[PDB]
Design a binder for this molecule. Structure first.
Ligand code: HBN
Ligand code: HBN
Ligand code: HBN
Lengths: 144, 143, 144, 144, 143, 143
């Protein structure tokens, strides 16, 4: 096995099959998990949904700003990717369905320099042509 | 439901035994290329991907059309792995890049609508500490 | 003469002089033509106007998705160009007047590998300064 | 001292201390000055605020289009910078507070080839996370 | 109605006999440069355009100002012809690029408002099949 | 009120006697690097900044993390000074680039929230006319 938070984060995101057990195996291994969905690609809307769904699950303590700040940057990088480029032209109150996953823990290695946190996003953006949707994908790894 | 993009990433991360996954998808109609490059330099990655892509039949040895889609799918994915800074990927020493290419029809219609996806998983390491950061990227284009 | 669909497509677009005869010469040479205008730079608005004006003219059969899909990609490339970059800052419910041209046929050569299709756009984007307008231009060639 | 319009322009912008005297020293040295603020990052909104605050101060004569045109390009470059890139994702009716400075005169050197004009912008963009704001900065130098 | 951009493209495509078009516009107040380069490499194109531009008086042999506008008009147009991937234009072998530069006043006012437009027509060929794709680009900047 | 970005620019323009400003900020908790490069080539600038940055303790001699933030802050600032055309900065001959790096906490909280800002002031000159244009850029990233 590998304690690769990013890899784990994406696999968790990309498997619509028994997240129930896939999540428990992660939680059982020191990882804090958290999943969800958002029908908005809007930065505000996404970092809100995520910050929220994450505090309630224990992925990050709402005690202050530090842990919330680490999550934001991670989410932005991941979002900065979802809004690739051809997704810069696609901006006409279109339909978007992003699903995410957040992992928080320690990509151990040998040194416990601290805790990391991954935020991966996967969704679809409707095309202005019926029967055509584009796949989006973004990941953001940050150090708490 | 036939996500070329999603499929390519999974192939990329599932270090289970792609040998099954490749033949499982190859027999399912797709074209597959799996490789690894020790650089995140735009030019180097493209060349490698391009070589491994033809040598595997994922793309015909000649023809601007298919090559252009590969290149773009690849360029779009490279922007993911170099975290929004193509140029600095050239600057990264001691780095591993695994790539997966998938060419095929996204839907079941007769309409060829042939598409190609390049998925990149980057591991930026350190001569000492080892893995220090991971990077992902994806490119999905029609042929 | 040249059976260059792109070149033809642009000249047709760029000549406000007797499109009547310039169109007939193209139609007479195996090309399917179609022109129009749009006051929107919005992707949705543009690919809609175009898909429409094109099916009605016979540039593409609405029979399915394939031919409509080839037109969309062509239009996006052409639009991806109209929305250059300084047109990424210019986005304040400004005034835009895009004119287009669509050509469909066979850039023959020797092999009839199939049919191509060009979509060229030319228009103006008003500046937030009276007496100043920027010229836009985009072309998208695709294979049916 | 230096007759560097850009340098001067930025220092004027970046000093919330006695612009009163910092402005007079510039006016006393052949420079035409002008400062202000805008709560919008919108191109239209910004080039409007600036064109206005500038004509009223004598930075540019409203007599025609030439001097107004030189100001627009200068403002766009400066704005093109304020809307860096991570400010391309940050676009959800967020809060922005731009402050500016405009200098017009002659970066003398030896030749009076004419008159230049600098437009520098400095402000803050609120983050979708409480207790986090990004700093923006842009400068645009143009020749009247 | 005096579209520098539109004018430059037409000059580029009208292979009628530009010799008339160039003198027809040269006497109409514009500066004109017409050339061809066998590459879509950013650096190569700029250098060529730059040389042909000065050697034709479209721009003074020295002076950062005019050179900067040419470069930008050129860079904006190069993004058109390399279909949104500057870097891959460097990668294209066997390709033709015809270019047209036009410097002059866009309106009739006394206000110099000197502008420059670079128009690019790219032909991406194949050692065999010949022409496989066409690419266009335009750049319009004030001096 | 503790604007790392604003602070770095001021340090860059205030040619008063930074010797005081550097020690005034160094004792105020920040890390400071002040340098000059005779090029606007992305690679050259980064290398210089990188060298001067470590040699000054603004960043640890090793470690992908801090290096990545410097690089990005630097890349964001380079887009300012090359006026939106990274590639053409490489093309500029006879040019001066002064740079300022600042690494430290933006607020007073215990939460490290360590940030780094790169500020660039470019002077594009002419072998004759001298200064012909000035260019500014700024990059602000968290570590
Ligand atoms: N797929 C990823 C990132 C990633 C994947 N694994 C690690 N990082 C993405 O969207 N990255 C990006 C994109 C633009 C950016 C712009 C500024 C800073 C970081 C950025 C990161
Ligand atoms: N003038 C053209 C294209 C062209 C002209 N002739 C052929 N192609 C344009 O706008 N191209 C673009 C721009 C961005 C793009 C981004 C992604 C994919 C294709 C793209 C094509
Ligand atoms: N800080 C500066 C500019 C500058 C500073 N000093 C001189 N110029 C900025 O925002 N520049 C930019 C950015 C994008 C641009 C895009 C097109 C043309 C000019 C551009 C100038």
């Amino acid at each position: 096995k590998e304690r690769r938070i990013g890899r784990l984060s994406v696999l968790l995101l990309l498997n619509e099959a028994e997240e129930s057990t896939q999540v428990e195996e992660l939680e059982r291994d020191g990882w804090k998990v958290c999943l969800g969905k958002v029908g908005s690609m809007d930065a505000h809307k996404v970092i809100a949904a995520i910050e929220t769904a994450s505090k309630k699950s224990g992925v990050i303590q709402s005690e202050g700003y530090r842990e919330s700040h680490a999550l934001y940057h991670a989410t932005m990088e991941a979002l900065h990717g979802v809004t690739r480029g051809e997704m810069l032209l696609g901006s006409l109150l279109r339909t978007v369905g992003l699903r995410f996953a957040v992992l928080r823990g320690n990509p151990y290695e040998s040194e416990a320099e601290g805790d990391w946190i991954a935020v991966s996003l996967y969704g679809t953006i409707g095309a202005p042509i019926k029967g055509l949707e584009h796949e989006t994908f973004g990941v953001g790894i940050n150090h708490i």
